[PDB]
Amino acid sequence: GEELFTGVVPILVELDGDVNGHKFSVRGEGEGDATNGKLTLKFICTTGKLPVPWPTLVTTLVQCFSRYPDHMKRHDFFKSAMPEGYVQERTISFKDDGTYKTRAEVKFEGDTLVNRIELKGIDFKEDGNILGHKLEYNVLDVFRSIPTDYKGQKLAEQIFQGIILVSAVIGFIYGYVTEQFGWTVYIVMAGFAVSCLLTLPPWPMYRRNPLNSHNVYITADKQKNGIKANFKIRHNVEDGSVQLADHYQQNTPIGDGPVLLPDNHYLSTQSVLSKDPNEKRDHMVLLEFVTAAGIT
């Protein structure tokens, strides 16, 4: 399956959607390059105007084009299910608003990677951000704090010094206000033991990467022979607020053959949304970069 993504691969995306009773269809064409993790597509609403903001559709509209580094190749489930493909299902909850429920089949049809989606939207608010078209034209990953030795480990033994000396000074006054200074020596050694227990172990440092969001968290699902994943998308509202959408994902291979069930890892993605100046139909031009990471 991975050998199918060795060069540039053409892409077709077809979506049929119904949100709060508003029927609409989307068709997209472009190309993907899994070697560099790059995507270019132009999407068209084949039913006139789109009843939802284009950014709400971006995560639905082919993670077999993520760039997996060479040391994670045996964890690339998406390419390993090809050509017969996989079924991707999602629940996307927009906070204080409705929910998308999606089912998609991603497969090869000839030489073309095809993504066919059915989308249902329920319980949205006519005045809300989605149906009110108050979202701004961008899609942003929510950055995830991930285990990362580090400078600013000065804090570790600054804290060590803190306890080991406040033990001294607060213990010193204790030892003097009672009659025994054997107390003040036990207290400082006790402060040493507590300091050693607290700041000697290698606690994982939880930092957000400045450049790589690590938003999509993929884990294996051995009972359905597939994967599961979750992430959050940030949408900027015209009033200056943000709108969050919680994604839950399950993928199951269509074929009978072996697939690569991965260990836990992350996907980082970057979406560029633009327009075509010569296009009079409702449309979205999309440029995407996706990279895998997360495990010497």
Short mmCIF file of C-alpha atoms in Angstrom, two decimals:
data_model
loop_
_atom_site.label_atom_id
_atom_site.label_comp_id
_atom_site.label_asym_id
_atom_site.label_seq_id
_atom_site.Cartn_x
_atom_site.Cartn_y
_atom_site.Cartn_z
CA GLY A 1 0.00 0.00 0.00
CA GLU A 2 2.79 2.43 0.84
CA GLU A 3 4.30 1.91 -2.63
CA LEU A 4 1.09 3.38 -4.08
CA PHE A 5 2.01 6.77 -2.58
CA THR A 6 5.53 6.99 -4.02
CA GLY A 7 4.89 9.95 -6.33
CA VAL A 8 2.10 12.48 -6.80
CA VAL A 9 -1.37 10.91 -6.61
CA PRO A 10 -4.55 12.54 -7.94
CA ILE A 11 -7.41 13.02 -5.49
CA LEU A 12 -11.19 13.18 -5.83
CA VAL A 13 -13.44 14.17 -2.92
CA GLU A 14 -17.23 13.84 -3.06
CA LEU A 15 -19.41 14.87 -0.11
CA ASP A 16 -23.18 14.68 0.32
CA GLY A 17 -24.34 16.63 3.36
CA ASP A 18 -27.52 17.52 5.19
CA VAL A 19 -27.34 19.89 8.17
CA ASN A 20 -30.56 20.90 9.97
CA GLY A 21 -32.40 19.94 6.78
CA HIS A 22 -30.22 21.94 4.35
CA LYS A 23 -29.10 19.54 1.61
CA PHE A 24 -25.80 20.26 -0.12
CA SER A 25 -23.06 18.53 -2.09
CA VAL A 26 -19.33 19.17 -2.47
CA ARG A 27 -16.88 17.95 -5.12
CA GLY A 28 -13.11 18.36 -4.89
CA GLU A 29 -10.12 17.66 -7.11
CA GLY A 30 -6.39 17.93 -6.56
CA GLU A 31 -3.24 15.99 -5.77
CA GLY A 32 -1.32 14.61 -2.83
CA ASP A 33 2.34 13.82 -2.18
CA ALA A 34 2.74 11.56 0.85
CA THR A 35 6.54 11.72 0.59
CA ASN A 36 6.47 15.43 1.50
CA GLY A 37 3.08 15.35 3.27
CA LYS A 38 1.49 17.91 0.94
CA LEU A 39 -2.06 18.38 -0.40
CA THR A 40 -3.63 20.72 -2.94
CA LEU A 41 -7.37 20.66 -3.65
CA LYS A 42 -10.04 22.92 -5.08
CA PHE A 43 -13.53 22.32 -3.67
CA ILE A 44 -16.81 23.35 -5.31
CA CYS A 45 -20.32 23.38 -3.86
CA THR A 46 -22.24 21.50 -6.55
CA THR A 47 -25.61 22.69 -5.16
CA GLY A 48 -25.25 26.48 -5.26
CA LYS A 49 -24.43 28.18 -1.95
CA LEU A 50 -22.98 26.22 0.96
CA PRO A 51 -25.23 26.29 4.06
CA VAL A 52 -22.21 26.07 6.41
CA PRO A 53 -18.84 27.82 6.52
CA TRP A 54 -16.18 26.12 4.41
CA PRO A 55 -13.77 25.83 7.41
CA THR A 56 -16.24 23.52 9.17
CA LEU A 57 -15.81 21.01 6.31
CA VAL A 58 -12.00 20.92 6.13
CA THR A 59 -11.34 18.02 8.50
CA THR A 60 -14.00 15.94 6.73
CA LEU A 61 -13.08 16.52 3.09
CA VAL A 62 -7.08 11.72 3.44
CA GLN A 63 -4.54 11.00 6.16
CA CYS A 64 -2.90 8.47 3.83
CA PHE A 65 -1.05 11.59 2.63
CA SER A 66 0.49 12.37 6.02
CA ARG A 67 4.29 12.35 5.99
CA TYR A 68 5.46 9.56 8.26
CA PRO A 69 9.20 9.79 9.00
CA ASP A 70 11.22 6.73 8.06
CA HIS A 71 11.37 5.47 11.65
CA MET A 72 7.54 5.40 11.90
CA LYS A 73 6.79 3.67 8.58
CA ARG A 74 5.59 0.52 10.36
CA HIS A 75 3.00 2.70 12.14
CA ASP A 76 1.31 4.12 9.01
CA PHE A 77 -2.11 2.48 9.13
CA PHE A 78 -3.66 4.66 6.41
CA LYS A 79 -1.29 3.68 3.60
CA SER A 80 -1.32 0.03 4.71
CA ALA A 81 -5.08 -0.32 4.14
CA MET A 82 -4.74 0.77 0.51
CA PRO A 83 -5.86 0.17 -2.20
CA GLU A 84 -9.07 -1.37 -0.81
CA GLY A 85 -9.09 1.46 1.72
CA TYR A 86 -10.76 2.17 5.04
CA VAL A 87 -13.99 3.53 6.52
CA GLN A 88 -13.58 6.77 8.48
CA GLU A 89 -16.34 7.76 10.91
CA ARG A 90 -16.38 10.87 13.07
CA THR A 91 -18.43 12.84 15.57
CA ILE A 92 -17.65 16.56 15.51
CA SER A 93 -19.17 18.53 18.39
CA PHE A 94 -19.21 22.31 17.99
CA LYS A 95 -19.36 23.74 21.50
CA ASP A 96 -22.65 25.49 22.36
CA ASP A 97 -23.92 24.41 18.93
CA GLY A 98 -24.75 21.31 16.90
CA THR A 99 -22.86 18.19 15.90
CA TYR A 100 -21.62 16.66 12.66
CA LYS A 101 -21.71 12.89 12.32
CA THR A 102 -19.69 11.61 9.38
CA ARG A 103 -19.02 8.36 7.56
CA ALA A 104 -16.54 8.13 4.71
CA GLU A 105 -14.94 5.53 2.46
CA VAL A 106 -11.38 6.33 1.35
CA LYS A 107 -10.23 4.07 -1.46
CA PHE A 108 -8.39 3.88 -4.76
CA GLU A 109 -10.59 4.02 -7.87
CA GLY A 110 -8.20 3.47 -10.74
CA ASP A 111 -5.11 5.58 -10.08
CA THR A 112 -7.13 8.13 -8.07
CA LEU A 113 -7.44 8.32 -4.30
CA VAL A 114 -11.15 8.88 -3.64
CA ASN A 115 -12.89 10.12 -0.48
CA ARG A 116 -16.69 9.70 -0.51
CA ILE A 117 -18.48 11.19 2.50
CA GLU A 118 -21.98 11.27 3.94
CA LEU A 119 -22.45 14.01 6.53
CA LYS A 120 -25.40 14.66 8.85
CA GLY A 121 -25.66 17.77 11.00
CA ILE A 122 -28.15 17.91 13.88
CA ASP A 123 -29.09 20.29 16.71
CA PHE A 124 -27.42 23.37 15.26
CA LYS A 125 -28.66 26.86 16.12
CA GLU A 126 -29.97 29.03 13.28
CA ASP A 127 -28.40 32.03 15.05
CA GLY A 128 -25.22 30.14 15.97
CA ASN A 129 -21.74 30.50 14.54
CA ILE A 130 -22.16 27.67 12.02
CA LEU A 131 -25.55 28.34 10.44
CA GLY A 132 -25.09 32.08 11.03
CA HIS A 133 -21.89 32.04 8.93
CA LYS A 134 -19.89 33.92 11.57
CA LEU A 135 -16.70 31.87 11.30
CA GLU A 136 -13.56 33.34 9.74
CA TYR A 137 -11.80 31.71 6.81
CA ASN A 138 -9.17 29.59 8.56
CA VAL A 139 -8.63 26.25 10.32
CA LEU A 140 -6.21 26.05 13.25
CA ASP A 141 -4.97 23.04 15.18
CA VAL A 142 -5.18 23.17 18.96
CA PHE A 143 -1.64 22.67 20.23
CA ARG A 144 -1.24 19.67 22.54
CA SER A 145 1.23 19.44 25.42
CA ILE A 146 3.48 16.41 24.93
CA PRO A 147 6.32 14.70 26.83
CA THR A 148 9.62 16.35 25.88
CA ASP A 149 15.99 17.29 29.72
CA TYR A 150 15.56 21.04 29.29
CA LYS A 151 16.93 24.37 30.44
CA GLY A 152 14.66 25.78 33.03
CA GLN A 153 15.55 22.66 34.96
CA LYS A 154 17.04 25.39 37.16
CA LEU A 155 13.51 25.50 38.58
CA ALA A 156 13.86 21.85 39.61
CA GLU A 157 16.78 22.47 41.96
CA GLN A 158 15.78 26.05 42.70
CA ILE A 159 12.79 24.28 44.26
CA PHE A 160 15.21 21.75 45.75
CA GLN A 161 17.20 24.62 47.30
CA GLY A 162 13.94 26.21 48.42
CA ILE A 163 12.68 23.26 50.45
CA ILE A 164 16.14 22.29 51.75
CA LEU A 165 16.65 25.83 53.09
CA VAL A 166 13.16 26.75 54.27
CA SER A 167 13.49 23.46 56.16
CA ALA A 168 16.63 25.01 57.65
CA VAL A 169 15.26 28.45 58.50
CA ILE A 170 11.78 27.37 59.62
CA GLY A 171 13.32 24.39 61.39
CA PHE A 172 16.01 26.58 62.94
CA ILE A 173 13.45 28.80 64.67
CA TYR A 174 11.56 25.67 65.73
CA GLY A 175 14.69 24.15 67.26
CA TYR A 176 15.39 27.37 69.13
CA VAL A 177 11.87 28.06 70.42
CA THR A 178 11.77 24.58 71.90
CA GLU A 179 14.73 23.52 74.04
CA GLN A 180 16.22 20.92 71.67
CA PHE A 181 18.29 21.56 68.55
CA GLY A 182 18.30 17.86 67.72
CA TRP A 183 14.91 18.76 66.31
CA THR A 184 16.46 21.36 64.01
CA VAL A 185 18.88 18.77 62.59
CA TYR A 186 16.16 16.17 62.04
CA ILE A 187 14.06 18.79 60.26
CA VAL A 188 16.82 19.77 57.81
CA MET A 189 17.61 16.13 57.02
CA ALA A 190 13.86 15.54 56.64
CA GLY A 191 13.84 18.49 54.25
CA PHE A 192 16.69 16.80 52.39
CA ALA A 193 14.77 13.54 52.10
CA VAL A 194 11.61 15.31 50.91
CA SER A 195 13.62 17.45 48.48
CA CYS A 196 15.39 14.35 47.16
CA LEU A 197 12.11 12.49 46.75
CA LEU A 198 10.47 15.43 44.97
CA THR A 199 13.16 16.67 42.55
CA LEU A 200 15.34 13.62 41.95
CA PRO A 201 12.92 11.54 39.79
CA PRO A 202 12.69 12.24 36.02
CA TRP A 203 9.26 13.83 35.76
CA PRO A 204 8.08 14.13 32.13
CA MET A 205 8.12 17.75 31.02
CA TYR A 206 4.82 18.75 29.41
CA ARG A 207 5.44 21.50 26.85
CA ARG A 208 3.66 22.65 23.72
CA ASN A 209 5.85 22.68 20.65
CA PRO A 210 5.93 26.22 19.19
CA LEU A 211 5.74 24.99 15.58
CA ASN A 212 4.16 21.51 15.66
CA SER A 213 0.66 21.24 17.09
CA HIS A 214 0.56 17.45 17.71
CA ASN A 215 -3.24 17.77 17.67
CA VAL A 216 -4.38 14.43 16.21
CA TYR A 217 -3.69 11.65 18.72
CA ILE A 218 -3.86 8.22 17.06
CA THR A 219 -4.16 4.96 19.00
CA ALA A 220 -4.66 1.41 17.78
CA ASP A 221 -8.07 -0.30 18.01
CA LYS A 222 -7.23 -4.00 17.86
CA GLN A 223 -10.84 -5.19 18.22
CA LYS A 224 -11.94 -3.44 15.00
CA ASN A 225 -8.50 -3.96 13.38
CA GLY A 226 -8.22 -0.18 12.95
CA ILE A 227 -7.39 3.04 14.77
CA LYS A 228 -9.06 5.68 16.90
CA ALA A 229 -8.16 9.34 17.30
CA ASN A 230 -9.31 12.60 18.83
CA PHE A 231 -8.40 16.27 18.43
CA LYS A 232 -9.82 19.79 18.70
CA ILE A 233 -10.12 22.43 15.96
CA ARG A 234 -10.13 26.18 16.65
CA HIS A 235 -12.39 28.43 14.56
CA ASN A 236 -12.16 32.21 14.87
CA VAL A 237 -15.45 34.09 15.06
CA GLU A 238 -16.15 37.51 13.55
CA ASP A 239 -16.69 38.99 17.03
CA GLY A 240 -13.14 38.10 18.11
CA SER A 241 -14.07 34.94 20.01
CA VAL A 242 -13.06 31.37 19.17
CA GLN A 243 -15.26 28.36 18.47
CA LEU A 244 -14.05 24.85 19.27
CA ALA A 245 -14.99 21.57 17.60
CA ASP A 246 -14.19 18.27 19.31
CA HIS A 247 -13.36 15.48 16.84
CA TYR A 248 -13.65 11.77 17.61
CA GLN A 249 -12.50 9.36 14.92
CA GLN A 250 -12.61 5.63 14.20
CA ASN A 251 -11.10 3.99 11.10
CA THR A 252 -11.71 0.41 9.98
CA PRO A 253 -10.06 -1.21 6.93
CA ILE A 254 -12.28 -2.44 4.12
CA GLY A 255 -9.94 -5.19 2.96
CA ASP A 256 -9.28 -8.59 4.48
CA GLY A 257 -5.51 -8.18 4.32
CA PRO A 258 -3.06 -7.23 7.02
CA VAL A 259 -2.84 -3.62 8.15
CA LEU A 260 -0.33 -1.84 10.38
CA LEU A 261 -1.82 -1.28 13.81
CA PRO A 262 0.29 1.57 15.24
CA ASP A 263 1.41 2.55 18.66
CA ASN A 264 0.28 5.94 19.94
CA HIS A 265 1.56 8.90 17.93
CA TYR A 266 0.54 12.36 16.74
CA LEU A 267 -0.25 14.18 13.51
CA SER A 268 0.57 17.85 12.99
CA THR A 269 -1.26 19.65 10.20
CA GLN A 270 -1.41 23.10 8.63
CA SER A 271 -4.34 24.25 6.48
CA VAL A 272 -4.21 27.23 4.10
CA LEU A 273 -7.61 28.37 2.82
CA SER A 274 -7.83 30.71 -0.17
CA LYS A 275 -9.99 31.61 -3.16
CA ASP A 276 -9.74 31.35 -6.94
CA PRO A 277 -10.31 34.84 -8.42
CA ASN A 278 -11.70 33.44 -11.70
CA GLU A 279 -14.21 31.11 -9.99
CA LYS A 280 -17.82 32.32 -9.83
CA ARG A 281 -19.08 29.23 -7.99
CA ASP A 282 -18.94 28.85 -4.22
CA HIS A 283 -15.58 27.21 -3.67
CA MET A 284 -12.57 26.72 -1.43
CA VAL A 285 -8.93 26.32 -2.43
CA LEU A 286 -7.02 24.36 0.21
CA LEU A 287 -3.32 23.76 0.81
CA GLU A 288 -2.42 21.27 3.53
CA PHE A 289 0.72 19.93 5.20
CA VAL A 290 0.54 16.94 7.57
CA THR A 291 3.40 15.32 9.49
CA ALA A 292 3.51 12.38 11.89
CA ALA A 293 5.59 12.30 15.08
CA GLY A 294 5.68 10.84 18.57
CA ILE A 295 8.07 7.85 18.40
CA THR A 296 15.64 5.75 20.02
#
